[PDB]
Design a protein around this nucleic acid. Structure first.
Ligand SMILES: [Mg+2]
Lengths: 1327, 542, 49, 79
DNA sequence: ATTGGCACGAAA
DNA sequence: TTTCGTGCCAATTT
C-alpha cells in the first residue's frame, strides 16, 4: 500500500532488515521545548508559571501590602508569519497577566483585609515559534541552537600529578548549582583538606564546619570511630577488635589468656586475625609507650580542679597520662587513624585551623569574601546565610538535586533547592573515602554528566532575569504610602522584561540567522548542538578531551558530522532517533530481548542506564521467530565491545542508521568510505545551491522523503479531497464531506511562494506537482519547494562520469566539464539581491521621492515611472537610477548670479540636490519586485496604491470563492424548497436567481453581511500604515534577480568528500565517447580515489550506471508503443531483483493508467535506495547490470574525441550525483589599482564591498626579506599603502613612462609618534 | 584628525572612546578647579582628586588598575595603550604589515599548457591592475590627447585598449602569493598570459612549493612598479630561479601524479606484446610504428641509439650502438638532452627515477636545459597518461582467497586463550598481550597474502608457455609508480584494517577484520571515528 | 599634527611608572607598592618631613 | 575602532587632473591658485587680479593666467 | 591553561 | 638573621 505521491515514482529499496520503529519528526526538539515554555501547566514548573511563582508574591518591608499573581494569557498576533516577513516586523503575541494588590491593616492580628484590587496588565510581546521551529524577529527567520552544558550537582575529579613535581594525585570535589555559588573541596600534598568558595583564596575545611555550628568533639565523632580506653588499674588494658589491626606491624607485646598470639616485632597476619576472631580476644594489655601518639577524642576535666586538663584532638603524652590517671579517671576516648585505610586528615586540618569557635569562622569567611573593610557579626551572618541557604540567591534545581542524591547514593530523588549540613558532611565523607581508596572519580565527558538546554529553558531564564528586576522596582516604589488610590497597572513597567526578551531573541550568541541554502541546511541547523555560548566553553580553552568521541555518544551524537577547524568537537549534531529526558539528558531507543527472542517493545535508555546492560549490535542476523543464530554475539556492555553468549543479551539496536545524523544518513555506501572523507562530504552536502530544475539523486538511501516533508519547504495537504483548481501560484482543494466541519464551505487554499529571496541571496520558489481533478489525501505533497522533486530531496544533478586522466586538466582535484552541461543549464542558479532607499525629514524641508532630477538627462529617467521608481521587469546595470530622490538645500538670500540662474533655467533646478538610489558597480539583474513603506499620516504615491490594489485582489478572490460556494449551496436549498410547491419546471429556469423561505432569505442576507465584514477587515488590515523610525518618511525596496551559469573556477562536489574546481569547459566533439557515440559529461581523476579511500563513489557510479540502463530499457520500450503487459512484466522483474529484500512491489494491484504513469516517471532511470549500513551488495549490482544488458565489471571502451583512436584500457563509466557549492568565482575575483583610504592610517581599505586592496602581512615581508628584494619591499611599504605624496608622484611618473619612485615616510609612523607623545613620553627623530 | 567622530545616518555623531575619556578628564578637572576656587571642605576635594586620578588612569591605560570603565553595551573603552600595543595595535597591524594598491586575488585553476615561467591572468583583472600604464600608453601614441580621454576610453573598453594591454604586459613580471606564506617560496614571479574567464591558471610543477591544490584555493597577485622591482622579480623571485630548496638543497620541481603515472606506463615492458622482436633504426621509427598501430608501447625490441658523453676538455663525443629496449623508452629518449646516457631511461621510471634524471640533468648540463627538460617531461607525462586510459574499478581491489582461513585460525587461537583464562592459568595482562600479538600476526599474514596476490600476473609466452610478470593492475600501478597511495592504504582497501586505539591510547583487542571493498558494520565504523577525529583535532589545533 | 594640553588642577601619577611590575616609583622611593597606592588614592597619610 | 574613508571632492578631481597635465612649475602654481578659488558649483569666486597677486611673482602677466585658466576650463566637467 | 617574576611566610 | 618555598599577578596563545 503506497500513497498517491509515492505511487507515482516508487524507489527500489535494497534494504533487507525489517523496520520496527519509524523515523520520528525531525523538529521535535524545538517544538516540544517551546511548548513547555508557552503552554499552561497546572503544576508550578515548566514555563512562565515557574518564573511567576519564583518571584511572586512581592511584599514590601512594612508588610502592609503585597502583589499576588493569578494567571497569564497570550493574545492573538496582529500579523501572520507571511505578513510579518513582508512588512519586516516581529511575529509575537502580547502577554496579559492578572495581578492583584491587597491592603493589610494595623494594630490587628495578622493582616486584616482592608481592600483587594485585581487588574490585568500588559507585560510586553513574546516572540512565537512557527510551525517549522523558527522565529521571525525582523522580517527574517532565526534559529536558537540548543546548548550542551555541564549538569548541576556534585562531581569528584583530580589532577593527574601535573600540579606537583612528585606526581601525587590531589583529589577534589565541586558542587555546582543551577543558580548560585559553587563550593569546592580539595586536598594538598601534605594531605590536609581545604575548602574554597566561589573560586577564591583557599581556606581550611574546618572553617565551614565550625560555621555550621559544630564543636570539635562533634566533628571528631562524625569523622572518626571512637576507641575506648579502660583503665583496669594496670597499664591501660585495651578492648581489642581484630579487624583494626589488618595490615599493621605490632610495636609492642600482644598477649591474651596466657597465649602470645603476636610477639614484639612481628606483624599481624590474616591468620592471626582469624584466630583472634575465633577466640573473641577482647582484653589486651598495652605499655605506656603505645600511647605516645594516640589522640584523645573528647575533653576530660579533673573533678578536683575543675579546669581543662587537655583540649580535644591532641595527642596524649606520658605526663598527661599520669595526670589523668592520678585524677581518678577510668574511661578515655581516642580516634582510630591507621595510615593505610583510615587516613588522619580531619585531625591535621583541625590542627592547621586557627579558629576554635563559631563566630571567628564567620568573621574569617566575611573577610575572605570582602577584603578591605572592618568585619561585622550581623553582616557576616547575613553573608553566610545568603551564600548557600537562601532560596532567593541559591537554587539546586530538580535535575541538580537528582544528580546530587544519585552521586551520594541516596534513595529520595526530590528535595529542597538549597544546601544543608548533611549534604556537606556527606560530600566531605565521600571525598575522604575516595582519598582512602574506596571510590572512583567522575568523567566530565560522559553524556550522563552533560545536559541539553533548549530555547524554552533559556527564554524562561531570561524572563526570570527581567522579572527579578521588575520585582526590585516594585519593592523600591512600594515604600511610599498611597495604597488608597494606586492600581497595579501603574505599579509596574513592562520595559525591562520586553527589553530582556528582545535582547535574548535578537542578539544572543545562540540565536542565529537560519542557514537557508537548502532544506538539509535548515534541518541540520535546527538539530544543532553547541558547547559554546553563555555558560559553556570557549574554543581557545577547550582542550583535546572535550573534543573527542565518547562511547556514550553512541546513538545520541553523530560521530562523523562536525566542522573541521577551531570548532571541531564543539559543534555536534543530533542522531536520528535521539531524544531528551524530562531532565534534559539524551536517550536512545532499544528493543528488549526477553527469553532469548527480540520483542517489539521499545525502551528509551539514557547514558547512565545504558552501561548496566548488554546490548546487541544492529547488524546481527535473526530468524523468522526472532532468535540469534551466532552463539558469540558482538555487544557493548560497559563502554567496551566484546563477544557474549545468546542468553546474556538484554537489548538490541532498533535500526542500522541510529548511530548517524540526518546529513550522514543521506550518503549512499557510507560504510565503504573513510571517516574523514565522510565528514567532509557531510559538511559539503548542506552548502549546495538549488538549480533551475530539480533532479532526484537516482541513487539514494531512503531518507530523502523524510527530509523533504519534515522541512517546511513543500506544500502538504492538510485534509484530503480533490484538486478543484490548480495554478502556478495557487492550489484550491475541495475537501471531502467526511472531513468537513459543520456549517462550513470545505475548501483549502494554498498560496505558493514565488521567487523570493532567502538569507543567502538565493531563490525560493514553489512548483505545483498535482493535476486538475486528481484525488489527494492528508499528508500528500501538493507543491515542491527548492531542491525538491516529487516530494524527495534533490540537491544536485545526475552526471555521466568517466574516471581517467585527460591531458592534465583534472590534475589535483581539477574537473573537466563538457559544453553540453553548460548548454542544458543543468547548474544554472538564480540569485536575488535587495536594495533600499530611505527618504527622511531634514531641517530644510523633507526629502522627496520624485521624477524631477534637474541635472540628469532625459534618457537616464526613461526606466522610472511617474512616481520616480523603476518599472517592474526593467533590465538594469551599474550606475542606473532605481529610485529618484532629491535633498533640499536652503538659503533665503538670492545673489544676482543666483537670480540670473533661476531666471534662465527655472527655480526648480536651484535649492535642490540629488540623492537618488543607484545600482552599485558590477551589479546587474532584472527588477522583479518593488515594495513601498510609508509612515502613517503621510500621503501615498501612485505606486503604493497599485500595490495595495494588487494585495486586495487576492483576498477578494479567496473570499469570493468561499462565498460563491456557500451561495451555490444556499440556492440549491432554495430550489429544493421552492420546487416542493408550485413545481415550476421552466419558470425558475427562465427567471433569474433572485426568487420558511423568508428564513432562507434572511440567512442569505446574513451571509452577505458577514462576508462584507470579512472583506472590510481585510481591507483595513491592508491599508494600515507603518511605524518606521524617528525622522524616517518613506522606504523603498527593490529586488534584482540574476542567473549565474557554470564556468571555470566554480566549486563542484559529490557526496563522498570528493570536491574540486572546474578547470575547462570542453567542446562536445573533444569528449571521450563509447561505441554508440555518446560522450561523457564530466571526467574525474582516478588518482584521487586510492589515497582518500572513499570507495563509495565507485559503487555509486556502478549502481547509477545500472539504474540508467534500466531506465534506458524502459524508455526504449516506451518509444515503440507496446502493450502494458510487457511493460509491467519488465517493471516487476526490475522490482523483484535482489537477495531477500524487505520491499514487495505488486503491480497486479496497479491499474493500466497507474502503470503507464509509473513507466513515464521511470523512463529516465529507476531510483534506488541503499541504507547507510543495510545497502546493496556487489552481487546485486552485477545482477542489476545484467538485467540492463551492461557489462558486469562496469567498464567499457572509450575513444578519443580529437583523434578517434581507442584508449588502451577499459574505463569506469557511469552516473554520479554532483552538487554545485556556494563558492562562485563571480564573488571571488577582485582587483584594484587605486581607490579610497582610511582617514587615520591613510592605508587602503579591505574587502570587496569597497574597492579594497590585499594585505601584505608579516609573513610576506619575511619572504621578501629572504629573497633580498629590498626595492620591492620598500615600494610595498611606502608608495603603495600610506605615503600620500609618494602615491601621487608614483602615479604621475607611471603615466609619464618613468618607472621611478621617491620613497618618503609612512604616515602610520607619524600616527604612532603622536600616540606615544600623547602618553607623556618624549620620542623624536634626530639628525 | 587621529580621533575622528562617527558620522552615521540621521545626523547622529555619537562619540569615540578617546573622546569620552577626554571629556571625563576635562569635567573632573573643571569641577576640581571650581571647588578649589570656592574653598570647599576637604572631605569633598579629596574625593574629587581621587576621581580625577582614576579618570586620568582610565585615559592612559584603562583596566590596568581597578575595574575598566565600560561604554553603552558594557564593553571596556579603548585607551591610548590599547591603540599602541597588541596584535590590533599600530606595530603589528599598520607598520609590520599593511594593505597595498595594485593587488588582486581570485581562485586558481590548472594550466597544463603553460611554461614554467608563465602564469595565466584574467584580462579583466589585468585591465584594472595596469590602468596607469594603459593611460600612459594611450597618451603616448596619440589615441588620447588628455588624461580624461584615456579614462573614458578605458571605461568604455574599446577594442584598441586590449592591444594596448597586450603590449604593456609583454615583459612585466607579476608576483603570485598564497597564504599562509610559510617560506619564501610562497611568493613567486611569473610572466602573465592574458586569458578569458575569472580564474588564475597555475603551472602544475610549482604547485608543490605553494602547497596548493585545485579544490577552492585562492591566490593574490601583485604588480611591481619600478625598474628595480621588476628586475628583482625577474632575477630573484622568478620561478625558473627557484629549483633548489634553501632549507636542505633538494629539488622543488619534482613531478607527481599524472606525469609520473604516464611516464611509468610508457616505460614498461610486456612479455608478449605486438611488434616484439623487431629491429628499429631509431626512436623516430619507434614513434612512427606506435602511431600507426603496428607495434605496442611495451614491446621489447632492439633500437639503434646514439648517445653523447662529455670529454675531458668538456666537449661532446657521440657513440652509436644497438640497445635492447622497448618502444616507449625509445620514444621518450627523443626528449632527453644530448648530455645524458641512455641507461637513465632504459628502465621503469617511478617518482624517484624521474627525480634522479632531473637531478642528473641539472648537475651535468645546467639550468636552462633542466627547465626545458622539466617542461617536456610534464608534457609527455600528461599526454601518455591521458592516452593510457588508466581507470579504477571495484574489481581492482582484489581480496586474497586465504583471508578467511587466516581470520578463522586467529579466532580459534583467541578462543583457546580465552578458555584458558577462564580456567585461570594466566592473568589478564598476559592474555591481553597474547591476543594483541595473535591479531598482529594475523594482520601481517593477511597483508603479505594480499600483496603477493596483487603484484604478479600470468601471461602467455611466444611459444605458448606460461610466464609470471609484474601486474598491470591500475591500483598496483598507481601504488608502485609512486604517483598516489602507499602500502598501508592498499592494505586498508583490500585487506583487514587491523587494530584500533581508544582516544586515551589503549589498543582495542578485537580488530576490524573488514576492508573498504567490503562494508564495515556500525561498531567498526564507530570505533574508527576515535582515531579519525583525534587526527583531525590535532591537525586543527597545531 | 597639532596637539593640545590640559592644565590639571592637582598632580596625577602616571600609571605606567606605577603599575608595571618593576615599579619605578616604588623602587626609586624604596617603598612597597601597596603603601604607594594607598597614599595615591587618598586612603592613608605619609610624612614628608 | 572607526576611522572613516577619504572622499573625492571637486577640487580633488581638479588637482588630480592638474597633476597629470604637462604644466610648467609657474603654470602649475597658477593652476593650484585657480583650483583653490573654485566653489562647490564650479565657478571662479575671485578675479584674476587676486590670483596674480597670490602668485607673488612680478614676472607673470595676466595673459599667462588667462591661458592657464582656459586650459583648466576644458577639464572634466567641461565649463 | 601555562609560564615566569615578585612578595610573603616558614625554616636553618 | 639569611634562605628556600608558596601564593599572587601579568604576560602569552595563526
Ligand atoms: Mg585546497
Amino acid at each position: 500500500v503506497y500513497s498517491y505521491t509515492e505511487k507515482k515514482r516508487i524507489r527500489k529499496d535494497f534494504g533487507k532488515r525489517p523496520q520496527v520503529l519509524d523515523v520520528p519528526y525531525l523538529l521535535s526538539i524545538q517544538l516540544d521545548s517551546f511548548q513547555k515554555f508557552i503552554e499552561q501547566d497546572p503544576e508550578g514548573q515548566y514555563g512562565l508559571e515557574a518564573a511567576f511563582r519564583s518571584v511572586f508574591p512581592i511584599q514590601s518591608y512594612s508588610g502592609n501590602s503585597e502583589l499576588q499573581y493569578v494567571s497569564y494569557r497570550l493574545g492573538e498576533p496582529v500579523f501572520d508569519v507571511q505578513e510579518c516577513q513582508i512588512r519586516g516586523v516581529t511575529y509575537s503575541a502580547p502577554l496579559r497577566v492578572k495581578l492583584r494588590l491587597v491592603i493589610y491593616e494595623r494594630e490587628a492580628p495578622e493582616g486584616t483585609v482592608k481592600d483587594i484590587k485585581e487588574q490585568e496588565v500588559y507585560m510586553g510581546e513574546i516572540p512565537l515559534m512557527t510551525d517549522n521551529g523558527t522565529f521571525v524577529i525582523n522580517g527574517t527567520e532565526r534559529v536558537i541552537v540548543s546548548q550542551l552544558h555541564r549538569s548541576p550537582g556534585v562531581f569528584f575529579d583530580s589532577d593527574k600529578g601535573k600540579t606537583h613535581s612528585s606526581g601525587k594525585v590531589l583529589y577534589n570535589a565541586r558542587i555546582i548549582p543551577y543558580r548560585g555559588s559553587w563550593l569546592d573541596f580539595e586536598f594538598d600534598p601534605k594531605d590536609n583538606l581545604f575548602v574554597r568558595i566561589d573560586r577564591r583564596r583557599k581556606l581550611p575545611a574546618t572553617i565551614i564546619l565550625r560555621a555550621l555550628n559544630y564543636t570539635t568533639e562533634q566533628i571528631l565523632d562524625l569523622f572518626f570511630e571512637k576507641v575506648i580506653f579502660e583503665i583496669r588499674d594496670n597499664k591501660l588494658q585495651m578492648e581489642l577488635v581484630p579487624e583494626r589491626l589488618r595490615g599493621e606491624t605490632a610495636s609492642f607485646d600482644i598477649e591474651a589468656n596466657g597465649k602470645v598470639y603476636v610477639e614484639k616485632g612481628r606483624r599481624i597476619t590474616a591468620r592471626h586475625i582469624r584466630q583472634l576472631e575465633k577466640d573473641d580476644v577482647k582484653l589486651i594489655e598495652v605499655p605506656v609507650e603505645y600511647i605516645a601518639g594516640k589522640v584523645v577524642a573528647k575533653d576530660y576535666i579533673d573533678e578536683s580542679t575543675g579546669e581543662l586538663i587537655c583540649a580535644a584532638n591532641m595527642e596524649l603524652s606520658l605526663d598527661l597520662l599520669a595526670k589523668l590517671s592520678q585524677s581518678g579517671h577510668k574511661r578515655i576516648e581516642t580516634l582510630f587513624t591507621n595510615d593505610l585505610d583510615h587516613g588522619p586528615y580531619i585531625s591535621e586540618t583541625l590542627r592547621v585551623d586557627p579558629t576554635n569557635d563559631r563566630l571567628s569562622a564567620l568573621v574569617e569567611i566575611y573577610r575572605m569574601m570582602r577584603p578591605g573593610e572592618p568585619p561585622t557579626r550581623e553582616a557576616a551572618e547575613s553573608l553566610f546565610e545568603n551564600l548557600f541557604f537562601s532560596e532567593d540567591r541559591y537554587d539546586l534545581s530538580a535535575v541538580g538535586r537528582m544528580k546530587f542524591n544519585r552521586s551520594l547514593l541516596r534513595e529520595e530523588i526530590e528535595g529542597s533547592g538549597i544546601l544543608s549540613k548533611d549534604d556537606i558532611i556527606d560530600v566531605m565523607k565521600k571525598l575522604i573515602d575516595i582519598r582512602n581508596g574506596k571510590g572512583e572519580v567522575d568523567d566530565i565527558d560522559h553524556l550522563g554528566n552533560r545536559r541539553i538546554r533548549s530555547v524554552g529553558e533559556m527564554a524562561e531564564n531570561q524572563f526570570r532575569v527581567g522579572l527579578v528586576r521588575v520585582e526590585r522596582a516594585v519593592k523600591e516604589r512600594l515604600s511610599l504610602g498611597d495604597l488608597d488610590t494606586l492600581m497595579p497597572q501603574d505599579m509596574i513597567n513592562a520595559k525591562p522584561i520586553s527589553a530582556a526578551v528582545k535582547e535574548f531573541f535578537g542578539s544572543s550568541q545562540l540565536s542565529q540567522f537560519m542557514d537557508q541554502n537548502n532544506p538539509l541546511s535548515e534541518i541540520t541547523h535546527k538539530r544543532r548542538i553547541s558547547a559554546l555560548g553563555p555558560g559553556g566553553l570557549t574554543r581557545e580553552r577547550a582542550g583535546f578531551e572535550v573534543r573527542d568521541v565518547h562511547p556514550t555518544h553512541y546513538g545520541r551524537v553523530c560521530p562523523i558530522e562536525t566542522p573541521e577547524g577551531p570548532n571541531i568537537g564543539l559543534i555536534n549534531s543530533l542522531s536520528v532517533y535521539a531524544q531528551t529526558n524530562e531532565y534534559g539528558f539524551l536517550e536512545t531507543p532499544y528493543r528488549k530481548v526477553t527469553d532469548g527472542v527480540v520483542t517489539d517493545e521499545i525502551h528509551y535508555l539514557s547514558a547512565i542506564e545504558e552501561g548496566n546492560y548488554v546490548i546487541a549490535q544492529a547488524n546481527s542476523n535473526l530468524d523468522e521467530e526472532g532468535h540469534f543464530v551466532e552463539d558469540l554475539v558482538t555487544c557493548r556492555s560497559k563502554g567496551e565491545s566484546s563477544l557474549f553468549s545468546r542468553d546474556q543479551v538484554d537489548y538490541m539496536d532498533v535500526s542500522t542508521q541510529q548511530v548517524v545524523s540526518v546529513g550522514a544518513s543521506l550518503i549512499p555506501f557510507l560504510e565503504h568510505d573513510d571517516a574523514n572523507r565522510a565528514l567532509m562530504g557531510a559538511n559539503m552536502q548542506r552548502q549546495a545551491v538549488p538549480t533551475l530544475r530539480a533532479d532526484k539523486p537516482l541513487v539514494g538511501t531512503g531518507m530523502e522523503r523524510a527530509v523533504a516533508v519534515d522541512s517546511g519547504v513543500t506544500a502538504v495537504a492538510k485534509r484530503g479531497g480533490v484538486v478543484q483548481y490548480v495554478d502556478a501560484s495557487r492550489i484550491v482543494i475541495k475537501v471531502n464531506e467526511d472531513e468537513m466541519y459543520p456549517g462550513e464551505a470545505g475548501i483549502d487554499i494554498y498560496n505558493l511562494t514565488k521567487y523570493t529571496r532567502s538569507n543567502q541571496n538565493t531563490c525560493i520558489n514553489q512548483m505545483p506537482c498535482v493535476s486538475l481533478g486528481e484525488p489527494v489525501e492528508r499528508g500528500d505533497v501538493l507543491a515542491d519547494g527548492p531542491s525538491t522533486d516529487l516530494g524527495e530531496l534533490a540537491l544536485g544533478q545526475n552526471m555521466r562520469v568517466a574516471f581517467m586522466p585527460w591531458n592534465g586538466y583534472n590534475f589535483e582535484d581539477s574537473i573537466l566539464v563538457s559544453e553540453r552541461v553548460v548548454q542544458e543549464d543543468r547548474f544554472t542558479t538564480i540569485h536575488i539581491q535587495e536594495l533600499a532607499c530611505v527618504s527622511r525629514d531634514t531641517k530644510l524641508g523633507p526629502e522627496e521621492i520624485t521624477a524631477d532630477i534637474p541635472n540628469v538627462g532625459e534618457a537616464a529617467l526613461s526606466k522610472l515611472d511617474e512616481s520616480g521608481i523603476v518599472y517592474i521587469g526593467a533590465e538594469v546595470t551599474g550606475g542606473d537610477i532605481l529610485v529618484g530622490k532629491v535633498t533640499p538645500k536652503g538659503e533665503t538670500q538670492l545673489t544676482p548670479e543666483e537670480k540670473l540662474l533661476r531666471a534662465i533655467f527655472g527655480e526648480k533646478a536651484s535649492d535642490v540636490k540629488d540623492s537618488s538610489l543607484r545600482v552599485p558597480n558590477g551589479v546587474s539583474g532584472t527588477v522583479i519586485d518593488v515594495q513601498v513603506f510609508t509612515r502613517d499620516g503621510v500621503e501615498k504615491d501612485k505606486r503604493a496604491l497599485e500595490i495595495e490594489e494588487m494585495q486586495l485582489k487576492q483576498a477578494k478572490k479567496d473570499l469570493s470563492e468561499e462565498l460563491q460556494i456557500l451561495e451555490a449551496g444556499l440556492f440549491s436549498r432554495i430550489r429544493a424548497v421552492l420546487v416542493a410547491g408550485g413545481v415550476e419546471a421552466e419558470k425558475l429556469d427562465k427567471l433569474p436567481r433572485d426568487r420558511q423561505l423568508e428564513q432562507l432569505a434572511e440567512q442569505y442576507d446574513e451571509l452577505k453581511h458577514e462576508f462584507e465584514k470579512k472583506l472590510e477587515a481585510k481591507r483595513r488590515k491592508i491599508t494600515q500604515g507603518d511605524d518606521l523610525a524617528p525622522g524616517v518618511l518613506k522606504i523603498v525596496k527593490v529586488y534584482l534577480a540574476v542567473k549565474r551559469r557554470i564556468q571555470p573556477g566554480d566549486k563542484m562536489a559529490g557526496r563522498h568528500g570528493n570536491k574540486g574546481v572546474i578547470s575547462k569547459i570542453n567542446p562536445i566533439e573533444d569528449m571521450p565517447y563509447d561505441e554508440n557515440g555518446t560522450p561523457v559529461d564530466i571526467v574525474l581523476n582516478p588518482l584521487g580515489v586510492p589515497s582518500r579511500m572513499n570507495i563509495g563513489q565507485i559503487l555509486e557510479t556502478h549502481l547509477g550506471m545500472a539504474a540508467k540502463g534500466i531506465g534506458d530499457k524502459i524508455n526504449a520500450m516506451l518509444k515503440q508503443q507496446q502493450e502494458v503487459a510487457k511493460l509491467r512484466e519488465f517493471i516487476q522483474r526490475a522490482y523483484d531483483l535482489g537477495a531477500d529484500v524487505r520491499q514487495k512491489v505488486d503491480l497486479s494491484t496497479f491499474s493500466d493508467e497507474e502503470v503507464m504513469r509509473l513507466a513515464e516517471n521511470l523512463r529516465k532511470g529507476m531510483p534506488i535506495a541503499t541504507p547507510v549500513f543495510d545497502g546493496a551488495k556487489e552481487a546485486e549490482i552485477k545482477e542489476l547490470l545484467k538485467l540492463g544488458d551492461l557489462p558486469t565489471s562496469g567498464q567499457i571502451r572509450l575513444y578519443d574525441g580529437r583523434t578517434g583512436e581507442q584508449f588502451e584500457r577499459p574505463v569506469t563509466v557511469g552516473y554520479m550525483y554532483m552538487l554545485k557549492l556556494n563558492h562562485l568565482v563571480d564573488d571571488k575575483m577582485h582587483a584594484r589599482s587605486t581607490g579610497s583610504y582610511s582617514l587615520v592610517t591613510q592605508q587602503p581599505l579591505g574587502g570587496k564591498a569597497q574597492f579594497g586592496g590585499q594585505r601584505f602581512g608579516e609573513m610576506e615581508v619575511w619572504a621578501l626579506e629572504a629573497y633580498g628584494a629590498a626595492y620591492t619591499l620598500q615600494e610595498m611599504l611606502t608608495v603603495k599603502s600610506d605615503d600620500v605624496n609618494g602615491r601621487t608622484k608614483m602615479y604621475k611618473n607611471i603615466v609619464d613612462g618613468n618607472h621611478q619612485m621617491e620613497p618618503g615616510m609612512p604616515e602610520s609612523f607619524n600616527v604612532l609618534l603622536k600616540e606615544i607623545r600623547s602618553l607623556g613620553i618624549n620620542i623624536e627623530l634626530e639628525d | 584628525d587621529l580621533r575622528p567622530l562617527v558620522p552615521l545616518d540621521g545626523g547622529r555623531f555619537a562619540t569615540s572612546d578617546l573622546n569620552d575619556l577626554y571629556r571625563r578628564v576635562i569635567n573632573r578637572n573643571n569641577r576640581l578647579k571650581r571647588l578649589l576656587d570656592l574653598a570647599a571642605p576637604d572631605i569633598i576635594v579629596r574625593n574629587e582628586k581621587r576621581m580625577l586620578q582614576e579618570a586620568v588612569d582610565a585615559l592612559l591605560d584603562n583596566g590596568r588598575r581597578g575595574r575598566a570603565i565600560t561604554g553603552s553595551n558594557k564593553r571596556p573603552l579603548k585607551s591610548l595603550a590599547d591603540m599602541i600595543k597588541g596584535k590590533q595595535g599600530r606595530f603589528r597591524q599598520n607598520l609590520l604589515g599593511k594593505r597595498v594598491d595594485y593587488s588582486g586575488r581570485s581562485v586558481i585553476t590548472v594550466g597544463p599548457y603553460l611554461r614554467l615561467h608563465q602564469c595565466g591572468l584574467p584580462k579583466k583583472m589585468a585591465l584594472e591592475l595596469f590602468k596607469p600604464f594603459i593611460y600612459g600608453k594611450l597618451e603616448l601614441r596619440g589615441l588620447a590627447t588628455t588624461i580624461k580621454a584615456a579614462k573614458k576610453m578605458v571605461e568604455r573598453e574599446e577594442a584598441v585598449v586590449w592591444d594596448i594591454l597586450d603590449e604593456v604586459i609583454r615583459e612585466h613580471p607579476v608576483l603570485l602569493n598564497r597564504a599562509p606564506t610559510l617560506h619564501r617560496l610562497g611568493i613567486q614571479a611569473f610572466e602573465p598570459v592574458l586569458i578569458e574567464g575569472k580564474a588564475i591558471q597555475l603551472h602544475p610543477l610549482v604547485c608543490a612549493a605553494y602547497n596548493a591544490d585545485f579544490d577552492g584555493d585562492q591566490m593574490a597577485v601583485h604588480v611591481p612598479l619600478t625598474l628595480e622591482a621588476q628586475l628583482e622579480a625577474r632575477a630573484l623571485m622568478m620561478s625558473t630561479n627557484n629549483i633548489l630548496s634553501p632549507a636542505n638543497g633538494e629539488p622543488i620541481i619534482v613531478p607527481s601524479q599524472d606525469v609520473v603515472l604516464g611516464l611509468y606506463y610508457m616505460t614498461r615492458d610486456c612479455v608478449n606484446a605486438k611488434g616484439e622482436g623487431m629491429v628499429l633504426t631509431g626512436p623516430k621509427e619507434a614513434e612512427r610504428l606506435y602511431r600507426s598501430g603496428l607495434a605496442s608501447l611495451h614491446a621489447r625490441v632492439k633500437v639503434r641509439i646514439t648517445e653523447y658523453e662529455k670529454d675531458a676538455n668538456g666537449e661532446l663525443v657521440a657513440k652509436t650502438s644497438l640497445k635492447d629496449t622497448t618502444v616507449g623508452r625509445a620514444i621518450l629518449w627523443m626528449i632527453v638532452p644530448k648530455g645524458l646516457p641512455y641507461s637513465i631511461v632504459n628502465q621503469a621510471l617511478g617518482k624517484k627515477a624521474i627525480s634522479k634524471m632531473l637531478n642528473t640533468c641539472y648537475r651535468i648540463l645546467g639550468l636552462k636545459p633542466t627547465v626545458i627538460f622539466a617542461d617536456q617531461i610534464m608534457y609527455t607525462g600528461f599526454a601518455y597518461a591521458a592516452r593510457s586510459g588508466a581507470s579504477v574499478g571495484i574489481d581492482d581491489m582484489v581480496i586474497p582467497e586465504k583471508k578467511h582461513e587466516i581470520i578463522s585460525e586467529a579466532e580459534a587461537e583467541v578462543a583457546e586463550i580465552q578458555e584458558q583464562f577462564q580456567s585461570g592459568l594466566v592473568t589478564a595482562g598476559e592474555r591481553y598481550n597474547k591476543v594483541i600479538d595473535i591479531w598482529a600476526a594475523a594482520n601481517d599474514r593477511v597483508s603479505k597474502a594480499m600483496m603477493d596476490n596483487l603484484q604478479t600476473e600470468t601471461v602467455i609466452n611466444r611459444d605458448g608457455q606460461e610466464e609470471k610478470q609484474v601486474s598491470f593492475n591500475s591500483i598496483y600501478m598507481m601504488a608502485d609508480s609512486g604517483a598516489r597511495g602507499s602500502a598501508a592504504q592498499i592494505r586498508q582497501l583490500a585487506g583487514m584494517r587491523g587494530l584500533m586505539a581508544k582516544p586515551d591510547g589503549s589498543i582495542i583487542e578485537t580488530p576490524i577484520t573488514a576492508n573498504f571493498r567490503e562494508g564495515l558494520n556500525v561498531l567498526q565504523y564507530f570505533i574508527s571515528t576515535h582515531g579519525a577525529r583525534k587526527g583531525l583535532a590535532d591537525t586543527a589545533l597545531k | 599634527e597639532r596637539m593640545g594640553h590640559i592644565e590639571l588642577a592637582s598632580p596625577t601619577a602616571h600609571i605606567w611608572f606605577l603599575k608595571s611590575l618593576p615599579s619605578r616609583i616604588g623602587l626609586l622611593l624604596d617603598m612597597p607598592l601597596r603603601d604607594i597606592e594607598r597614599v595615591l588614592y587618598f586612603e592613608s597619610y605619609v610624612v614628608i618631613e | 575602532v572607526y576611522q572613516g574613508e577619504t572622499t573625492q571632492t571637486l577640487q580633488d578631481y581638479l588637482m588630480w587632473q592638474v597633476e597629470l597635465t604637462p604644466f610648467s612649475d609657474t603654470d602649475r602654481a597658477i593652476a593650484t591658485s585657480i583650483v583653490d578659488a573654485v566653489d562647490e558649483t564650479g565657478y571662479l569666486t575671485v578675479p584674476l587680479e587676486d590670483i596674480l597677486e597670490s602668485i607673488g611673482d612680478e614676472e607673470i602677466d595676466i595673459d599667462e593666467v588667462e591661458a592657464v585658466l582656459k586650459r583648466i576650463q576644458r577639464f572634466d566637467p567641461v565649463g
